[PDB]
């Protein structure tokens, strides 16, 4: 016996109503996917595990119209079972079979594929002509690249069911415990076997269970499924939230404040966002399958539309804004809107993408709310001038004087409380498995959000809190059973010092070949808002926003560790790639990434990431990257300010182009500062192996020519003062002439008629980006 409530049955029944597909894909039961998955769950009840799998087999047995057009076979099947064993009513269990059946349609267009393809794979959401092989979601041993093999042999499908058999046996039957099991094994499995299916099976079950839970919270019953008034009445409600002012929040801090501290302002922005996501889910009564995505301060939640839910969301938005204003004075703001939708608003109707129409209505309400940044304060423009207001030297907070503690490092400096909490977090980050979400007035609360307080779950400590946020893994370990497992991912690569902590700006400015400079890269994915507007169903948005997030959360750390080099090939390098690169990943969201480190390895990582991003997609999405090279003892708000001004300089021009180095140019409008990606790798295959041998050493017989290569950039500045060949064409032939080397750069001595006919710049103009990188690497 077990007391089970009704929303546990609907959220779990929709979450595994299509368990017969992977089992049906394998030849173990030879029956209809519902017939196989019903017997797959009835055999799982028979083995060690819960008693409820006999009840949960009904969702997989009857979930089509051909299986549910009886209305007499259903009732006598429930009579052979017993909802009285679980506390469920006869009417309660019959409602949830119609909630899950109807939500399976709103999850994806109801198109019948007749006979399923014997073994067609998951086609890529980016390039739908290609397809993924089946592989474990582990973030090691393989990068998912969409390839040309278009059929799955039925051996790993049988190995899939075996590996899924004992993972479902060990995990307890709740919603938060089955989602990481089904995500590791059913991510690269297509839901419907057809040509061009780009919906993963996990995201199809994650969105059936989201909609079916949101239908039961609203209160639609079984006869509201048979009739209309579920697809003709606004019952759902798309919540969307957005953090405004992130680059001004992380990257405002002064020359005081280490990288170790700057890295923990990013961990603290991630926990403010999860504190608001998990608060909406708890008060509205929903599970984490409702959260469509949560990547970089931008979340979407499918929820119900009741007057009791709108009253709760209006208070969560209220209490989160009066916390953010009091703690961070108008530097960080969360805009939360909700647009009521219906079942017809999911998917396509009448040849129109009605889901993207319902999101442009929601995106427009976010834009108006961002232009009213703290309107819900009522004392926002009223002034109070109580005396003795002092200011922190690390960030720019204005406190009352007296609330400034002495710091931990330098007791002469007096800083705010939340910079003493975030330096102790910065030392505790290299041994940190996650954070425990609990009440704010609790022992050991090290950082606080707007609703709940967070305790660091250390490497060898015990977790405390009503829900634990476990970092970078889908495996719950050494946590209590009722501890509500929430897995989150973060790009967390950092160079370790002789201690265990994070390397400083000194130690990254060291170990760079040539000059000692700090390299700062910043980039994003271009035209990404267009790509998310192509999605018909919310299960396609679930797949497109989760594969997109895993490149930057999960697979950008393997690119730094030298993995995946067969796909990447040969990139512009200055040295052989070390086993432990001095690269610190600060931030890496859905389409953004800020990374600091040594300049010669920031440069090589810029091409290693883009070449691997090209393979992860099908070439359909690209990267703009801005690169910078700075003095070390430069304030980090100024390093971030310059590369942000270089990333959009490389974005408004052609948007698929890198900004390598600084450049003086003419003003004639035909000259652009930033190289295309294929252009600069072509100039590296041409110009660099003639003059450069690697590891800060010039090519043989070109030693003691350090003054020679600065002359070619003095010739190049004659082109900048006046184009159309005033003097530079023969002076290049003279300096190559007097040294006896003329195989060096033959394109620079004679004028290019191909350059004049298209009004493109001369080949002497583009050699600035290849010489000036080699001159800094062979400085000393």
């Amino acid at each position: 016996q077990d007391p089970m409530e009704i929303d546990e049955l609907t959220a779990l029944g929709g979450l595994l109503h299509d368990i017969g597909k992977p089992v049906q894909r394998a030849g173990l039961y030879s029956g209809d996917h519902s017939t196989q998955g019903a017997r797959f769950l009835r055999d799982l009840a028979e083995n060690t595990g819960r008693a409820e799998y006999e009840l949960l087999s009904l969702f997989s047995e009857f979930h089509h119209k051909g299986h549910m057009k009886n209305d007499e076979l259903m009732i006598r099947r429930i009579k052979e079972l017993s909802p009285e064993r679980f506390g469920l009513t006869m009417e309660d269990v019959l409602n949830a079979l119609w909630i899950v059946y109807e939500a399976d349609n709103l999850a994806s267009g109801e198109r019948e594929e007749g006979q399923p393809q014997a073994s067609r794979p998951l086609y890529s959401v980016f390039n739908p002509g290609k397809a993924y092989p089946w592989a474990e979601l582990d973030f090691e041993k393989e990068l998912p690249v969409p390839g040309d093999v278009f059929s799955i042999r039925s051996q790993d499908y049988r190995e899939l069911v075996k590996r899924l058999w004992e993972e479902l046996s060990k995990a307890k039957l709740r919603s938060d415990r089955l989602l990481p099991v089904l995500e590791k094994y059913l991510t690269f499995v297509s839901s419907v076997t057809s040509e061009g299916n780009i919906i993963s099976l996990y995201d199809h079950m994650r969105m059936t269970s989201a909609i079916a839970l949101a239908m039961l919270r609203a209160g639609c019953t079984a006869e509201d499924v048979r009739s209309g008034r579920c697809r003709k009445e606004k019952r759902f409600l798309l919540i969307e939230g957005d953090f405004s002012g992130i680059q001004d929040f992380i990257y405002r801090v002064s020359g005081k404040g280490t990288l170790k501290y700057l890295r923990a302002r990013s961990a603290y922005l991630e926990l403010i966002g999860w504190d608001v996501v998990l608060e909406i889910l708890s008060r509205l009564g929903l599970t984490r399958a409702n959260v469509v995505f949560n990547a970089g301060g931008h979340f979407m939640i499918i929820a119900q539309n009741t007057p009791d839910a709108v009253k709760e969301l209006e208070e969560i938005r209220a209490k989160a804004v009066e916390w953010l204003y009091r703690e961070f004075e108008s530097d960080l703001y969360l805009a939360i809107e909700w647009e009521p939708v219906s079942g017809r608003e999911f998917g396509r109707e009448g040849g129109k993408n009605l889901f993207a129409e319902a999101r442009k209505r929601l995106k427009h309400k976010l834009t108006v709310r961002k232009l009213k940044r703290f309107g819900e304060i009522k004392g926002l423009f009223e002034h109070g001038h109580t005396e003795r207001l002092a200011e922190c030297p690390v960030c720019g907070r204005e406190l009352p004087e007296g609330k400034l503690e002495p710091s931990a490092s330098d007791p002469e400096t007096k800083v705010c409380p939340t910079c003493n909490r975030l330096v102790s977090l910065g030392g505790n980050l290299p041994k940190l498995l996650g954070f425990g979400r609990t009440a704010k007035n609790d022992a050991g609360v090290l950082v606080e959000g707007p609703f709940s307080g967070f305790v660091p779950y250390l490497q060898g400590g015990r977790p405390v809190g009503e829900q634990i946020l476990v970092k970078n893994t889908l495996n719950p370990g050494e946590i209590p059973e009722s501890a509500q497992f929430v897995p989150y991912f973060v790009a967390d690569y950092f160079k370790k010092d002789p201690k265990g902590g994070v390397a400083t700006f000194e130690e990254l400015s060291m170990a760079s070949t040539g000059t000692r400079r700090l390299g700062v890269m910043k980039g994003d994915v271009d035209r990404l808002g267009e790509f998310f507007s192509s999605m018909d169903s919310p299960s396609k948005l679930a797949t497109a926003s989760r594969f997109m997030d895993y490149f930057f959360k999960g697979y950008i750390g393997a690119i730094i560790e030298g993995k995946f080099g067969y796909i990447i090939g040969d990139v512009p390098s200055l040295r052989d790639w070390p086993e432990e690169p001095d690269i610190v990943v600060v931030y890496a969201g859905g389409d953004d990434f800020f990374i600091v480190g040594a300049w010669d390895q920031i440069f090589e990582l810029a091409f290693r990431v883009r070449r691997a991003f090209n393979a992860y997609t099908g070439g359909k999405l690209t990267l703009s990257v801005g690169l910078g090279y700075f003095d070390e003892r430069t304030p980090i708000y100024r390093m971030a300010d310059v590369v942000s001004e270089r990333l959009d300089t490389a974005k408004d021009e052609g948007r698929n182009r890198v900004f390598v180095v600084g450049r003086s140019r003419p003003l004639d409008g035909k000259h652009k500062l930033s190289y295309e990606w294929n252009h600069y790798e072509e100039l590296w295959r041409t110009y660099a192996p003639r003059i450069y041998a690697g590891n800060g050493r010039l090519k043989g017989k070109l030693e003691s020519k350090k003054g020679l290569l600065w002359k070619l950039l003095e010739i190049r500045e004659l082109y900048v003062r006046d184009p159309n060949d005033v003097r530079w064409a023969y002076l290049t032939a003279y300096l190559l002439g007097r040294h006896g080397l003329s195989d060096l750069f033959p394109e620079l001595v004679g004028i290019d008629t191909k350059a004049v006919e298209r009004k493109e710049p001369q080949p002497v103009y583009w050699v600035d980006g290849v010489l000036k990188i080699v001159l800094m690497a062979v400085r000393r």
Binding site: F381, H383, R527, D631, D648
Partner: protein, 285 residues
């Protein structure tokens, strides 16, 4: 309408492009130096019940720039309905994150008609490293410093809407004193020094209830569309508290702003400027 454009022609770098409250601070320090404290009491009363100035804006060779109104973000799709949908997206975000517009394109944005952004900005914010030397054993210890550098004909202007008798006695003598001292920033290194010229500029603005501010305002009621500029200041070596201003280009409906007096424990009261400078605008629906 017709405004007076006080053109500030740079003699070097500027520390910053001065807001409307650090121009009124600089004008107010210039009047008490030239005339005295009794003339500052009449300078304040002429702006409370009268004339208003704006923030400083760049120009580049008789191409005066003005801030982008905040009315063109809600209705940006509605402005660009007559455009090819394969390039409406990149046109939108490039138009949205722009900061300034010239007079031809600023008039078209107030009436929600299509427009273009400038291609070149007339200045650059430059990081110049300085050094501190020990006098005996010349140990170098560097720090980093920010400056605004202008082009060969570019510079900074600000607007004035008020009676000519107040301009001739207060604002025009102040700008000749402020040409020889600085206009905010490290003025001991020659930053903020400039030559002053006077012109007249005309803006064709539509008649409505809603109007954009060309200055920081410190609003007296809730605005319609806005951007929070949070700044404090420094007054004779005393730190001013950070006040929530409104940015240039924010939209009010019959809001004069209001001039704040801070005690600040100083020989005399410190007034922070905070007043509107309205030009009519058409909001979307």
């Amino acid at each position: 309408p017709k405004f007076i454009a006080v053109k500030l022609i740079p003699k070097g770098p500027f520390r910053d492009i001065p807001r409307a409250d650090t121009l009124f601070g600089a004008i107010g320090n210039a009047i008490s130096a030239i005339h005295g404290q009794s003339a500052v009491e009449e300078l304040v009363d002429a702006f409370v019940g009268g004339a208003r100035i704006s923030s400083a804006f760049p120009y580049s060779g008789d191409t005066y720039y003005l801030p982008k109104p905040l009315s063109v973000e809600p209705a940006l799709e509605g402005i660009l309905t007559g455009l090819d949908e394969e390039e409406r997206y990149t046109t939108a975000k490039r138009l949205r994150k722009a900061k300034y517009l010239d007079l031809k394109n600023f008039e078209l944005a107030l009436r929600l008609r299509p427009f273009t952004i400038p291609e070149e900005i007339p200045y650059a914010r430059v990081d110049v490293p300085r050094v501190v030397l020990d006098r005996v054993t010349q140990d170098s210890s560097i720090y980093f410093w920010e400056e605004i550098r202008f082009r060969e004909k570019s510079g900074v202007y600000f607007l004035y809407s008020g009676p000519r008798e107040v301009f001739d006695g207060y604002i025009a003598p102040a700008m000749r004193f402020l040409g020889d001292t600085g206009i905010g920033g490290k003025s001991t290194w020659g930053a903020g020094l400039f030559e002053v010229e006077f012109h007249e500029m005309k803006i064709d603005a539509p008649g409505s209830e809603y109007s954009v501010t060309l200055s920081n305002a410190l609003p007296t009621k809730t605005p319609v569309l806005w951007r929070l500029l949070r700044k404090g200041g420094w007054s004779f070596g005393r730190r001013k508290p950070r006040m929530t201003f409104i940015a240039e280009g924010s939209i009010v409906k019959n809001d004069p702003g209001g001039m704040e007096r801070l005690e600040l424990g100083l020989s005399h009261e410190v007034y922070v400027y905070g007043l509107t400078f309205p030009l009519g605008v058409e909001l979307p629906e």
